[PDB]
Design a protein around this ligand. Structure first.
Ligand code: HDD
Ligand code: HDD
Ligand code: HDD
Lengths: 726, 726, 308, 83
C-alpha cells in the first residue's frame, strides 16, 4: 500500500476553502449534491477502490510494469496484447478540439424560475417556480486552443444546457451583448482573421496581430464588439463576475400562440469585476489556468456561482420602433429603453468527475430549443443553426453524439433514427420508419398544445425575393460603439484607449493602425485622439471634422453598459494574500481571519519558503505558497500583519508583491511595523485612500479593508501608478 | 390507428415454425429467454409503444411529414432543425464493413462445460459444470461484402464471444481445420487475390477468377484449404450443419503451470450437411439471405443451434511427434491420431434485437484470451494478434469499442486508460496512472494464481536469431491435401473435381489453369486427370509420373474428414415442400403433417397462387408461397399428395419444382395420382431408390421419406441427373 | 520471372470483344483515350513495372514472405515495421459505403452539345457545340449494399459529374422520371422501409418485404414510382439500355436573367431494353456482377455507352 | 490512424518520400494514388511479379534485420542490469 498512514492523500468530502485540500472529482468531493442529471450519469461512473487492474476485456493484469519480451533484455513480442491494448488506447486519446471556444471550464448545477412565465411562454422549464431544471454550464474563451491560457483579452462564451422535461434547451451565449459580425456567411472570415495566422500559427489567445485588425479596419460592423473586447470586459476576474447574453433576438410563444421578442441575459450575483491588462497578461504566464481553477475551487468551497436569468421583452408590434434593427446582432438593446425582467436563478454547485468525459465531450447548440421558444431571422443566428449539428460529426465522431452521457436528455427520447458510429441505444421497435402499421405507428407525432405538445414553428410571414443582400437597416456601425464609450467611467475609458493602443502597437503594417484610428474617429474624436497619440499618429483636419454618430433613440449614456458605474460589489469568495514573517503577531492574525471569515473571504498564507512558521504565541502556521509561487496577481487584496517585520523587510519578493499589488490597484492593509512597507510603494505618512494602516489589525482596520474590497479596485490610485517600476 | 383491428400485425411471442409468423426482434419474440449478458444489455434497450416521437434532444415532433418552408410551395428554411437532425443521422448511418468476413449472422446463447477441466486449465469458464457462460456467436463468409449472398462457395467464419467471469474470451474460428497461408505477413496478398479484382471490383463472393488461382498456383501452401473450399465443405446447408475449428494450436495452462497444446473444435449436434454447387449458386439468386434467414428462424422455432466444444490435446513433450509441425496452420491434426475430447455444449437460443447495434458492431479478436489459455508461435496466429485490435480503430470509430454494449464484459473492468472518441465511462478515480499513492494504488495488479489471478504468459523458451524466415518444417504442401482427398467418399470426390473444374473454367488466362492442374498432379493423379479432362488439358508424361506425397504418420485416410462417410443425420428443423392442388386428399395431408410434426420437420404448403385451397373434405389449407416464390432450392425434400392432380400436372412451375429437387438429389415422395409426376423426372414404373411412392400417404410412406431425409441426399442418383434438362 | 513466356498474361491494348482478353485497368487497356480530366489524373497514377517493392516510406523490402521472428519457429517481433505497416494498411482499407446507391459501376467519357444554348442558358458547358466536357458517370441500384447483386428489381441511379470550365456540375438522376416521395423530410422513413429490416437485416436488394409494402400502403404518393419499379423498368438489361432523368424541375438562366423551367433526360442511343423477372432474379445468382461486367466489357470492346 | 485520419497519411504531401514507393497496399480513407498495377498481391504472374523484392546488398538493396541472437523465456520482467 502506497497511501500515507495518516490518510492525508484523500481530500475531506466537505466544503473546504481554496488550498485547504487537494481538489477532487465532484462525486467524491460532494457525494450528497444531487440533481436529476447527475443521478442519471450513475450508469457510467466507474470507481476504482478495491478493484483489480484489468484489460478493457476484463482480464486481470499481473504485471503492469513490463512488456513481454524473449528474455529480460530481449525484444518485445507482438503477442503482448496487454501492452498493445494499453498503448492503442493511449495512442487514440485525443479528439478534435472545438473550432472556436476550445478553451473552457464547466460545472453542473440547477435552475428554477422565480414565478410561472406561462403568460408569455409555454416552455415547461419556465412554467413553475418549484420545478427545478438540471443544467450543465461551460464557460470559455474564443480564439485559443484547449491548452491556451484563461486570462487572455478575448470574448468569453457562457453556454448553458438545460435538461428540461420537454427536451434539451441550450442557451449558447457570450459575455457581451453583441457579436462582431452581421451574417453567418462571414464567420469563417472573421474567425480566420482573429485566429493564429496561417503561415506560422502565431499568436495564440490574442487579437493583437495584423490580420485581425486588417479585418476590423475593413469591416466596421465589427467595431461595436471590438469596443467591448478592448474595454476591461475583455479580461474578467472570474467566470463568476461577468454578464452573459444570448445576443440574438429570439421569440417566446405562449399557449395562445402569441410571439414576444426576447433577448436573454445572465446577471452575476457575485457582481461584475474585471482584471487590469498588465495583470491579466502576466497571469496568463504565472497561472494560465486561473479561471478554470477559480471556478472549480469556488464550487469546492460552497461559493457556488449564481446567475440571474433575465429577459428583455419587446412585443411583436414594436419590432420597428427602435432606430436600430432588432435582428442585427451587432446592435444591443439598451436597458434604459427595454428593462431586463428577472426570470430565475441558476446555481452551479458541483464540478464534473472527468474533464474529458463531461467537459470536452459536451455539445451545446443554439438550435436546441423547446416548445415555447422559437428563432427569428437574425442572419447570424440563422447560420449558427446549421453549424452546431454539423461540427459534432467530426468533433464527437458521428451522429450519436447525444448518446455521450453528458449530452443525453433526461426526458424521454424515441424516434426512427438508427445506426451511426458507436451506436449505444439498442432499438427493439419492429418499425424503423413511419407511418407504420407493424408497431401501430409508435412512436407517434404529438399535436402542438399548451404543455407536452409537439414542436411547431411560429408562422411568421415571409415576403421577399431570394437575395444575397444585407438589410439596409443593418448599415449603421458607429452609434452603438459611441453609446458604449460614453457609458464608461473615465478610468474604464482610459483602459479602452490603452487596450486599442497596446493591440495596435503589435500590428506590424502601419497603414492598418492608421485605418483603425480612422474608424475610431467615426465613433468618438476623444477616443481616436488618445489612441492616435499613443501610436504617434496625428489626425488630419478632415478626421477632426467627422460628425459624431447620432444618439441611440435619444440616449447619451446607459450606465448598465459599464462594469463599475453602479456598485454591485460582493466580497464573498474573494481571496486575500497574508504575507507572513517568522514571528507573526498572532493577535493581528486572529482579528484578520475572523473578519475575513465573517464575510466569506478566503486567505492564503504566504512566506519566503514552504513548511510552517510559528507565531508569537506558539501557533504553528502552515504556509500555502511562497511570495513567488502565488503572486499578487492571484489575490484580491494584500494584508501584512505585524510580528518580526525585519524577517521580510528586505526580501525582494515580499517587497515586489506589494509593488505589483499596488500597481494593479488592489487594496493593501499594513498593521504595526508592517507600515515600514509604506516606503516601497511611496505612501506619505498621512496615508492614502486604498492603503489601510493602524497600530494593529482591529475591527476598524478590517472593516475598512473589507469596504475597499467591495469596491474591487482603487481606481483613484491610477494617477499614482506610472511612477512605480513594477 | 394503422394496425389492423385483429392484431395480426404482431408476431406471437412464443416459439413458432418458419413462416408461421412474421419474424421479430429477439426480446419481443422470446421475452422469457435470458442470460447474464442479455440481462446486462437492458440499460440500453429502447422500447417504443406509447411514446411520443422526438428529436434526439427529447423535443416532441408535431409534423414528421413535412419540411419547414416559407409558404406551402416555398423554399425549405435552414432553421428546420428537426429536418436537419433527422437527415444528418441518416447521412451518417454507415460504418466501414469488416475487411474480411463482412457478411455474417449472429445470435445470443450460452455455454456450459460437462465437467470441471481444472486438471488441464485454470480457465474459469471451464472450472464448474454448473457455471454457465453467456455467448454471442457470429457466423460469416470471408470474401463478400455485407450485402453479398449467403450460399456462395467460400470458407465460413464461426466466431464465439464468451463473456466469462474472468474476462472476454473470443474463439475466432472457421469451418475448416486449416487456413490457406502460413505467415500473417502474406494475409493482405492472399486476401487481395481472393477479393474482387482491383480494376473493376469483380467478382463478388467468388474465388472463380484469375487472381485467386494465380496466387494459389504460385503458393502451393494454399492447396490444403483450397481442397476444402472446392469440396462440399465450401457450401454448407446451414450454419447449424457445419463444423468449427480454431485452426491454430493454442495452450491450456493449469494451476501448476503445466502447458498442454490444444486445438479447438466445434461439433454440430444437428450433424454435417452441405448443398450441391448448382443449388448453392442458384440459391444466391433466389434467396441471397438463406443462411441468415435459416439461423434466425431455427431460433424463433426453438430448433436452437447446438454445438459441442471439443479439444485435441497434445502434451508438451509430444510437440515433435508428428510428420508435420503443430504450429503450421496449413496442417490438420488427424482425429485418428489425436482424438477430440468433448468439453461442453453451446446453445444459441436468442436472436438480437437490432442487427446493426449487436451484430454489425460486435468485435471478436483471438487475442482476447483469459488466464488458463495462452498462444503459441504459430506465425499466422502471431500476426492475427496485431490485426484485430488495430482494425477496430477505423471500423468502430476509436479505442472505446469495448464500451459498445454488445462488446462489454459482464465481469468487472477497471484500469487507468482514459478518453478517446465517444468515451462512455466517467472515471472517478483521482489517479489515472500507476503506481499512485493518491488512490492507494487502486485498481491494483493481481498475482497469477489458481483462480481469479492476473494474466501471466507461459515462460516458453525462445532461442534463435532475428530472422524473416519460414521454418523448413512448414515446407511440405501435398500430403495433407492428399489425406483429405482419400478420406472423401466417391461422390464427394466427384464434387471436388467439379468445384475445381467450374472455378478454373472462369479463369480467363489458360496458363493459370494449367499451373493449377500441375499442382493437383502433385497431390493425386486421379483428381488431376479428372480436372484436366474437364478443362481440355492433357497431362504430360512427366506429370503422370509425379510420385504422390507420403501418407500422414501412416494414415491412408481419416473418415472424420468427410462430410458423409459416417452418417450423422438429424432431421429436426429441416423443411419439406408440399405441393398442393385445388382438391387435395386430406387423409394424405393429415398423415404427412402428423409424421413431420413427430420428427420436428417443418412443412411449407405451396400452390400456383396465394390465398387458400379447400381439400376434398372441406378443410381450408392456407398457402405459404407459390412454386416460383419458394423454389425447391430452399427445402430438404418434396412431397406431393393426391387430389385433383390434373390441376397442376401441366403446370410448368410444379413440374420444374420436381426436376430441380430431383437434380439436386433431394428425396421426393408422391402419393396416388401424384405418381403421374414420375414421367416428368423419368422414373421407371418399378420406381427407384430415393423416390417414395404409394397409393396413399401412409403405412410406411412417411417412414421411408423420413429415412431418406436422415441420409440428407440421394447420392446414388448422381449418374441419373446429367440426363435431366433442369 | 513468373509471367508466361508467350506473354499471354497481358491483354492487348486495343478494343476487343467480351471474353477475348483478360479485362484491364482503363489506362493500360486504352492508353490513347484521353480527355482533360483523364489527363489531369496523371500526377496521381502509379505504375508498377520495373519498380522495387517498398514500404509506404520508400524502404525496399527484401523478404515480402515472412514476419520477423526470434528463430524460424519463434515468436513474431514487435520491431517488424514492415509487417505492421502492411497489416495496418490492410486493417483500414474499408470506408463507409454510400447510405443509398452503395452498389454502382462507373466509367469516364465526354459530353458535347449539339448547338449553342446561350438563348436559354449561360451554362458555359452548353455554350458551343465544340465545347468538350469530360464526364465521370456512376450507375447504381438503390437499396442493396456495395456487395449486392446487379440485376435486382430496383430503381437505378444515373449520376454524371461534368467537369466544366466554370465548375463541377453533377446531374444526379435515376432511371425513372419521378421519385417515391414528395418531401425530403420523409426520405429516412422511405429508405428505412425499403432497406433490409432492422431486427435481422433481411432482405438484400429486394423491395419484396413487409415494411416496404407497409409504407407504400400508407403513403399513396409512392404509387407512381412503385408502378415503374414493378414494371420491367425495374430490371434493365444493361445500364446502356435504360433512360435517365433528373426528376426535379430545375431552372435554366440565360445572360438576360430569364428563367426557364427544365427537366433533364438521358436517352440511350442503344435503345431501351429490360430482362424478365425470372431471368433477372436467377441472374443475381449466376452473375451478381452482370451489369458491372457488361458496362466494363462494352467499353473495352468499343461499344461505348452513348446517351443524348 | 486517428490523428491523420487513416492509413494513407504517407500521401499527405509533407509526409511523402521523395524516392520511389511502390507496393501492393490499396484503398483506405483519403486514397490519393491511383494504382494501375493489374495485380494487388504477390507473388503474381499477371504483372510479372512487379513491383519486386530486392535482395539486401551494399547500396540500393532491400531491408534485412541484423540477425541478433535472442535467447530467454517469454517474460514480463525488467532486466536486473537496469535496476
Ligand atoms: C456559423 C458559424 C457560427 C457562428 C456565426 C457562431 N458560432 Fe458559436 N460555435 C460554432 C459556430 C458558430 C461552432 C463551430 O459550431 C462551435 C464550436 C464547436 C461546437 O461544438 O460549436 C461554436 C461554439 C460556441 C460556444 C462554445 C460552446 C461550448 O462551450 O462547447 C459558444 C459559447 C458560442 N459558440 C457562442 C456564439 C455566440 C454568442 C455567437 C454569436 C452571437 C456565435 N457563437 C456565432
Ligand atoms: C493478420 C490479419 C489476419 C489473419 C492472418 C487472419 N485474420 Fe481473421 N480477421 C482479421 C484479420 C486476420 C481482421 C482484419 O482483423 C478481421 C476483419 C474485421 C475484424 O474485426 O477482424 C478478421 C475477421 C475474422 C472473422 C469474423 C469475426 C466476426 O464475425 O466479426 C473470423 C471468423 C476470422 N477473422 C477467422 C480467421 C481464421 C480462422 C484465421 C486463420 C486461422 C484468420 N481469421 C486469419
Ligand atoms: C434527403 C436525402 C436524399 C433524398 C431526398 C435523395 N437522396 Fe440521393 N442520395 C442521398 C441523399 C438523398 C445521399 C445520402 O447523400 C447519397 C448517398 C451517398 C452519397 O454520396 O449521396 C445519395 C446518393 C444518390 C445517388 C448515387 C450517386 C453516386 O453514384 O455516388 C443517386 C443516383 C441519387 N442519390 C439520386 C437521387 C434522386 C434521383 C432522388 C430523387 C429525386 C434522390 N436521390 C433523393
Amino acid at each position: 500500500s502506497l497511501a500515507p498512514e495518516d490518510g492525508s492523500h484523500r481530500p475531506a468530502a466537505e466544503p473546504t476553502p481554496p488550498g485547504a485540500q487537494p481538489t477532487a472529482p465532484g462525486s467524491l468531493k460532494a457525494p450528497d449534491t444531487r440533481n436529476e442529471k447527475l443521478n442519471s450519469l450513475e450508469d457510467v461512473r466507474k470507481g476504482s477502490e478495491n478493484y483489480a487492474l484489468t484489460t478493457n476485456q476484463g482480464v486481470r493484469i499481473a504485471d503492469d510494469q513490463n512488456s513481454l519480451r524473449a528474455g529480460s533484455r530481449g525484444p518485445t513480442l507482438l503477442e503482448d496484447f496487454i501492452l498493445r491494448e494499453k498503448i492503442t488506447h493511449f495512442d487514440h486519446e485525443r479528439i478534435p478540439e472545438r473550432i472556436v471556444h476550445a478553451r473552457g471550464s464547466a460545472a453542473h448545477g440547477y435552475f428554477q424560475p422565480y414565478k410561472s412565465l406561462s403568460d408569455i411562454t409555454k416552455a415547461d422549464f419556465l412554467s413553475d417556480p418549484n420545478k427545478i431544471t438540471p443544467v450543465f454550464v461551460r464557460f470559455s474563451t474564443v480564439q485559443g486552443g484547449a491548452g491556451s491560457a484563461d486570462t487572455v483579452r478575448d470574448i468569453r462564451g457562457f453556454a448553458t444546457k438545460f435538461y428540461t422535461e420537454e427536451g434539451i434547451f441550450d442557451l449558447v451565449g457570450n459575455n457581451t451583448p453583441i457579436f462582431f459580425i452581421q451574417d453567418a456567411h462571414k464567420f469563417p472570415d472573421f474567425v480566420h482573421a482573429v485566429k493564429p495566422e496561417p503561415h506560422w500559427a502565431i499568436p495564440q489567445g490574442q487579437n493583437a496581430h495584423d490580420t485581425f485588425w486588417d479585418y476590423v479596419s475593413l469591416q466596421p460592423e465589427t467595431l461595436h464588439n471590438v469596443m467591448w473586447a478592448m474595454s476591461d470586459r475583455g479580461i474578467p476576474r472570474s467566470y463568476r463576475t461577468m454578464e452573459g447574453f444570448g445576443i440574438h433576438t429570439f421569440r417566446l410563444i405562449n399557449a395562445e400562440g402569441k410571439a414576444t421578442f426576447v433577448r436573454f441575459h445572465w446577471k452575476p450575483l457575485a457582481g461584475k469585476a474585471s482584471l487590469v491588462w498588465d495583470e491579466a497578461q502576466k497571469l496568463t504566464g504565472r497561472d494560465p489556468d486561473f479561471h478554470r481553477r477559480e471556478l472549480w475551487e469556488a464550487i469546492e468551497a460552497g461559493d457556488f456561482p449564481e446567475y440571474e436569468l433575465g429577459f428583455q421583452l419587446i412585443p411583436e408590434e414594436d419590432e420597428f420602433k427602435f432606430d436600430f434593427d432588432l435582428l442585427d446582432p451587432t446592435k444591443l438593446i439598451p436597458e434604459e429603453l427595454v428593462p431586463v425582467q428577472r426570470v430565475g436563478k441558476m446555481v452551479l454547485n458541483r464540478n464534473p468527475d472527468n474533464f474529458f468525459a463531461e467537459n470536452e465531450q459536451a455539445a451545446f447548440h443554439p438550435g436546441h430549443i423547446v416548445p415555447g421558444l422559437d428563432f427569428t431571422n437574425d442572419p447570424l443566428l440563422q447560420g449558427r443553426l446549421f453549424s452546431y449539428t454539423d461540427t459534432q460529426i467530426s468533433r464527437l465522431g458521428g451522429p450519436n453524439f447525444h448518446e455521450i452521457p453528458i449530452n443525453r436528455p433526461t426526458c424521454p427520447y424515441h424516434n426512427f433514427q438508427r445506426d451511426g458510429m458507436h451506436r449505444m441505444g439498442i432499438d427493439t421497435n419492429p418499425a424503423n420508419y413511419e407511418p407504420n402499421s407493424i408497431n401501430d405507428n409508435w412512436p407517434r407525432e404529438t399535436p402542438p398544445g399548451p404543455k407536452r405538445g409537439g414542436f411547431e414553428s411560429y408562422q411568421e410571414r415571409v415576403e421577399g425575393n431570394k437575395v444575397r443582400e444585407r438589410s439596409p437597416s443593418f448599415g449603421e456601425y458607429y452609434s452603438h460603439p459611441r453609446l458604449f464609450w460614453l457609458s464608461q467611467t473615465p478610468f474604464e475609458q482610459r483602459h479602452i484607449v490603452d487596450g486599442f493602443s497596446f493591440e495596435l502597437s503589435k500590428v506590424v503594417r502601419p497603414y492598418i493602425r492608421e485605418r483603425v484610428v480612422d474608424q475610431l474617429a467615426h465613433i468618438d474624436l476623444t477616443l481616436a485622439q488618445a489612441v492616435a497619440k499613443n501610436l504617434g499618429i496625428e489626425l488630419t483636419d478632415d478626421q477632426l471634422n467627422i460628425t459624431p454618430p447620432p444618439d441611440v433613440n435619444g440616449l447619451k449614456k446607459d450606465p448598465s453598459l459599464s462594469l463599475y458605474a453602479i456598485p454591485d460589489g460582493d466580497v464573498k469568495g474573494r481571496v486575500v494574500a497574508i504575507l507572513l514573517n517568522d514571528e507573526v503577531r498572532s493577535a493581528d492574525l486572529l482579528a484578520i481571519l475572523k473578519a475575513l471569515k465573517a464575510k466569506g473571504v478566503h486567505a492564503k498564507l504566504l512566506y519566503s519558503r514552504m513548511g510552517e512558521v510559528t507565531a508569537d504565541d506558539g501557533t504553528v502556521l502552515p504556509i500555502a505558497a511562497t511570495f513567488a509561487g502565488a503572486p499578487s496577481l492571484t489575490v484580491d487584496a494584500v494584508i501584512v500583519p505585524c510580528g518580526n517585520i525585519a524577517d521580510i523587510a528586505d526580501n525582494g519578493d515580499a517587497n515586489y508583491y506589494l509593488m505589483e499589488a499596488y500597481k494593479h490597484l488592489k487594496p493593501i492593509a499594513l498593521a504595526g511595523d508592517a507600515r515600514k512597507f509604506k516606503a516601497t510603494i511611496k505612501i506619505a505618512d498621512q496615508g492614502e485612500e486604498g492603503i489601510v494602516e493602524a497600530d494593529s489589525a482591529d475591527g476598524s482596520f478590517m472593516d475598512e479593508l473589507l469596504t475597499l474590497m467591495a469596491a474591487h479596485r482603487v481606481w483613484s490610485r491610477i494617477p499614482k501608478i506610472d511612477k512605480i517600476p513594477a
